[PDB]
Amino acid sequence: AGTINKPKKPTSKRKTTRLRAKISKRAAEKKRKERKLARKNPEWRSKLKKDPGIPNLFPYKERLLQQIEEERIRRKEEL
Amino acid sequence: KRGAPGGKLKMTLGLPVGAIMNCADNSGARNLYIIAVKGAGARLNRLPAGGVGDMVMATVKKGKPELRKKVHPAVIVRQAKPWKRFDGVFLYFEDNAGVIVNPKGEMKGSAITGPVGKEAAELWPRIASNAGVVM
Amino acid sequence: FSETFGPKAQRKRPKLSFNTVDELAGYSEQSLDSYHARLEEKKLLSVATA
Amino acid sequence: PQNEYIERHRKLHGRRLDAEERARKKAAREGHKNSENAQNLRGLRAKLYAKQRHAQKIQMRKAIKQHEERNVPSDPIPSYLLDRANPTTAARFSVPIPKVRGISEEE
Amino acid sequence: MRYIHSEETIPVPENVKVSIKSRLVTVEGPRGKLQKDLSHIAVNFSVVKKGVIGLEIHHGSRKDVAALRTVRTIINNMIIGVTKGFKYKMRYVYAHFPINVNVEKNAETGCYEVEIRNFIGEKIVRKVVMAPGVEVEISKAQKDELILSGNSLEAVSQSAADIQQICKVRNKDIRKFLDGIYVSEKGNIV
Amino acid sequence: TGWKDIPPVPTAQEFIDIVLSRTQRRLPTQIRPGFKISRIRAFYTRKVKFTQETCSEKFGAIISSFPVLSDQHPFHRDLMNILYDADHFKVALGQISTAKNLIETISRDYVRLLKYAQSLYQCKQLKRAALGRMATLIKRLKDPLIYLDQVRQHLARLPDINPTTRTLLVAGFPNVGKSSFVRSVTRADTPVEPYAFTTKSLFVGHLDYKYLRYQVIDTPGILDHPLEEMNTIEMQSVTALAHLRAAVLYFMDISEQCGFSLKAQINLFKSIKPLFANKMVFIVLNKMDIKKFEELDPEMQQEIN
Amino acid sequence: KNLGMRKNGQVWLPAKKAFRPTKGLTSWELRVKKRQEQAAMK
Amino acid sequence: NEIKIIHLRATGGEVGASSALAPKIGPLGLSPKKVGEDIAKATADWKGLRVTVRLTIQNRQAQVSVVPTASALIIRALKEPPRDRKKEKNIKHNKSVSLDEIIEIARTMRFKSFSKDLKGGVKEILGTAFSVGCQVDGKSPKAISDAIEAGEIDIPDE
Amino acid sequence: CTVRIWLVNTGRTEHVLSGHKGSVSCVKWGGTDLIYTGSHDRSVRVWDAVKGTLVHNFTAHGHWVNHIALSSDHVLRTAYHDHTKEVPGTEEERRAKAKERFEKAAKIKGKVAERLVSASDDFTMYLWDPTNNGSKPVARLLGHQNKVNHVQFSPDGTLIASAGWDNSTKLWNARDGKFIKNLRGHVAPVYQCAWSADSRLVVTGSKDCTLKVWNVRTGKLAMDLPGHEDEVYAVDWAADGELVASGGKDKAVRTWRN
Amino acid sequence: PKSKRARVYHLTQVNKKGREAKERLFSNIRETIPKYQHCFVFSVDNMRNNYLKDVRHELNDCRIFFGKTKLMARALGTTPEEEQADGLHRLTRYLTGTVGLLFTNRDPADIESYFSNLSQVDFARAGTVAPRTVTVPPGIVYSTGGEVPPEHDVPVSHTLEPELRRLGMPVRMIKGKVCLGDEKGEASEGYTICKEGEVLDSRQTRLLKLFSICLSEFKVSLLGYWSSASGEVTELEAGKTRPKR
RNA sequence: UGGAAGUCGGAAUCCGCUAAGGACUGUGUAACAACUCACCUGCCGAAUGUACUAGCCCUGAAAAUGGAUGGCGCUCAAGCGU
């Protein structure tokens, strides 16, 4: 495009008070509306979230699984 | 090709759109009413105009009824407005007159009454062949 | 449309209004006669002003 | 000229001498050109380009999935109804729309 | 990621002289001398071994590490230019109007000039001026062939590109009108 | 004259893109809700009318540019019926005209509704409705547009054969020398190759004899089986023999290096003889450098005589 | 001399090496070992 | 005095195979009708079947031979009813072929096969029969090939 | 695109009839040991059932062929069984009685000539007599405004009944193919039709969940049979004339009587 | 790294083999040691190697493995604790480069006689020395490029012209015929593909293959064989001279 | 199919030899031929490939007097996060 030699009308970054107030009002209305939709949401939600686990690149993941196994066996023996 | 001829020097245009000129050949028409000029430019409010040797679009108002309901290409061969040639001579004819041709420039009729202008004679070789006086 | 004409066309046999050689010759005869009659009626039936 | 005259000229004389090389270099530059189009087109042209690229990406994903999957009617109808185009075919006396927006007399 | 140290290597032939001062590389060989300014790239030059030049970047990004490959290939191209040279063989073809190619050497510039006449019957005479250091001859072994030779690969290839781009067919079908001048072979003089 | 003056026929999606880009870029696109309702109605009515006008111009150009098979000479009409399916041709152009008429009807209906629309939202919905319905109408024409573009390219590449002039029509089996004769007497670039059906379409050249222009027509080869079993390639030659009042040069190869029996050549000549009524027929015995007529069987010579 | 044909015809280009700016950080034997504990852990 | 070999595909009991053949044999100096008659005489035992013919030409006379092919042998062994090709098209070879004559076809094809064993030759012929579309012992030739590979059906060695 | 002939006791195929370019939608076996097939490749074929070779190829239909019908179908379906309700003592007598019934139902002008009719999606029907006319059809049966789904000869062989997708059942003279009368009672496409043994009555089962009994001599709707909750797919009239069976999308068999 | 080369997914039938091919090769070799009484190692280097199919066909009683060198070395057993038979670890010193295993029951003299009498004329590969100078003449370019006389030769196909131009031949299209210079052999010298003693590169060898000119031969050099009865590896003539690892 | 040999189409798509090679991914022929791809081997030499997620950046639609992060101006900031 011929932007460098012949630039067009600039896009103003100077906000107006009316537009700022309107944007704030619409943001607050959207936030209240999404609260209402989340309240009346029929979409299913699990009781317990899926835990991502231990990353593979952690250098002591196998050892950490060893204490996990040992602690569960100890809990089974205690119970 | 359009009817505008090349190699034509600038001259005074004496016949604007709306003029009625005599019909100088034997096609059957008695006069031609100019509705358009070939090669006319574009200006606001300006009437198109033609001079001697120009092709115009003309309508027969008096003549045979067979020629009546059509638009014909015509060539202006005589004009009454004085115009200057390159040798410094201003000149004019006693009437405005033209001949009906086809878009390629062959004449509809067979003979021309009265003289024709030089500019018409060089620009249209059929009119030069059908003219008895070149003047 | 794609199997009739084009890069993927599969049509080989045309649709003919005749079956034999004599029918072809006759059909060409009345075809030319009808074409001439249509030209004659079209002829019987500088631009014009608006 | 008549019939397939450009193909006959192709048979007799060939291409320009650099046609294959220029075509190969253009096909090579297509990736840079597509990224330049994705980052530099403006407006409605950019929006249409984005939707087109989205559609081609979805179609390419479907083609790859089908090629990976290559190595592995509904309602009973009689024989005279087989191979024809048939519809899929899927107290409170309430209508499907029990309530709509009210329209005032001024509207 | 910022890489602590990255390095590239350029071997030098025995008859070649390399001088680097303030990133301005001068490469001299049997065929002559070439010179290029490389001060727009942050690089440290060194002599890591006899006949070996090392290029290193310290605490540079991936882009700064990758720029050393371009510097390596450019200096190797100057080395190949002063050792063996660069040669571009071009062919001009036509269908009906033979292309008349005249090659001359202008005395006051020292550069070669290639004049092209009768390109698809055109009355204009196209004139293309070669870069300084590019020599153009009309080949006698093969038919309708120009040979451009020099030390600078960029100069020779840009001259060949100018010769192609001056004979461009406009407003005609390129599947039918095949006249032009094309680069047919690229290689070394030696 | 020919049929090279037909403008290119776009596809369905290209057609929709072209029409909508004209509507987007040749008209103003900014209307405000605070304007007058007559102003809003005029804006959206102008959009609908302009879209219909562009569609009507394109469809009318497609319809008027293509040949009318009812108005052609019998040779040209039957040649188009052989090369192209005549039913498919007429159905494709009828679908084009039907879509044009339906687009006009939709435009009239939505302009009448936009006369009574009361807000910018309603006007916008009516405009989008009209444009979407026209787009659906164009979308159902996916196959006729492709078919008509292929037909247009082939028609532009067709030879120009005058059916009412002096013409020498060369016919026979393949590999007998028809294209060799046509190439030797004219300037036409018909290929000459040793395999059968080298020439798959009609070719035409021209010559001058006694200051008169003669046209010479080279045809594909014809085999010895009835009209129900001949394909379109041989139907081109058969249509040329049936409808062009010409001088038929039937080329015969008595050497039989064409691959066909001379019995089959005699039988094909006898079979296509009824097309030769009111026409002038010359058996041209070609390849005399290989085998002469005197070398042939006297019974065979008796049959040829 | 060069025995093969380069695709773009720039026969003066050298035999380039892979752009591996992280080359030399980890040895091969250690990577084989770490592959073994990685497979066991997975 | 040179030997020249030309391979062609011909339909048995048909003269018109020389139609496309004669454009090149004519320069060599043979009679196309004579070559077609020789081809028909050689392929008289292959009525209605496309077979490949070797033409050996030397000193301007030609001798013909019928080169066996697996598909032609399987279609012949199917024993289809005699029929005309012009009025009956789009046919399917859905009849049954017995495994013994499949082994016989493999023994005939042993000279063309590079398989080490008659079992491999039989499996090649079964694949060709699968491509043809017939049945072996009332079952699918792929299924008999799988049974032979698994060892349920024993193929004789040589 | 094939028709396979099976021997019942072994289960083995004797002949495979191939040559159709589409799905073979209908097959009939005539009393002169011929096999008639109709297919979606717009063709009807007559095959010799003894040798397995094609005899006739009729390619005059313009679309899919849905149903074909023989003039002797009613007697070939029931063999030696008749109105007497006793069977002959031996196999030779039973075969002789079956052949006599077939010849009586298939004689045309004193000679045995099985008459064939085919209905297609091109809105048309074709009447063929392969023995006396070969490949030239006896008549083009014309008048259905939509696809013709089912066709049947009358047991006495004088009438042809056709059911179309234009909600109509049409009656045809079986000798020259002339249209006689149109039966107009259905509001959805008629799927099947069937004749009574006395050739007075036609039962038609349609998509509108109804059966209708038509008297063909008065040309009028004798009986209306509602009761199917959904579309009717299969309709049959017993050879005894006692019962009419119907079934369809509602999954329940319905038997209808006087 | 957003800027990356786009990898082309291949919509073709055959996939990459993987480790299952290696396991199949291991099992096939380890089941073919005990069935055969000699195991030869043969070398074919810088050769097209397409006649190994005919070698396999003619030696139908033998078994030939032509696989990855290190894969065959690990199949036979490099170390004495890993070897499948007594002395197979001695044979693995010859498995370098392009080698093949030949399991046989025949007398070794028969194998040596076969591979000494086996000669096939072959196209040269890149890197070999040209034995004779090949120069295509000016004028009409023929299919063999002057190897056979032009009267018995056929003109080369017109589709090969851009390939010859890409390989460096200054050919052109004249009336559908590929010509070097002019149709009458004027204004252009003949083109020398290869000279005496020059090392051939892939461009020259591709030109020679396109013109169907063979400048090399297919020779199988036997390095040595292991005998199952003695447990001993006998070294052959190329086996003394070839480097070992 | 006039011709159709993996590559105008319809349907199947198996086996052998295998190191591996589709009853073929494209270019090509009137059909062949020829070239190319999938796959395999030799050379080389140590880390890569794919798909997502999170930051920052570009596009993700704009009219009409000349103008606005308040202005200058700012680029390891005079921008962004702590």
Ligand SMILES: Nc1nc2c(ncn2[C@@H]2O[C@H](COP(=O)(O)OP(=O)(O)OP(=O)(O)O)[C@@H](O)[C@H]2O)c(=O)[nH]1
């Ligand atoms: N010896 C000889 N050969 C001829 C003669 N005329 C034609 N031929 C050969 O016959 C072959 C067929 O030539 P064409 O001109 O293509 O004849 P055609 O095939 O019937 O013509 P088309 O089918 O229309 O292309 C050519 O390849 C020639 O070699 C002739 O007069 N003498």
Ligand SMILES: [Mg+2]
């Ligand atoms: Mg020919």
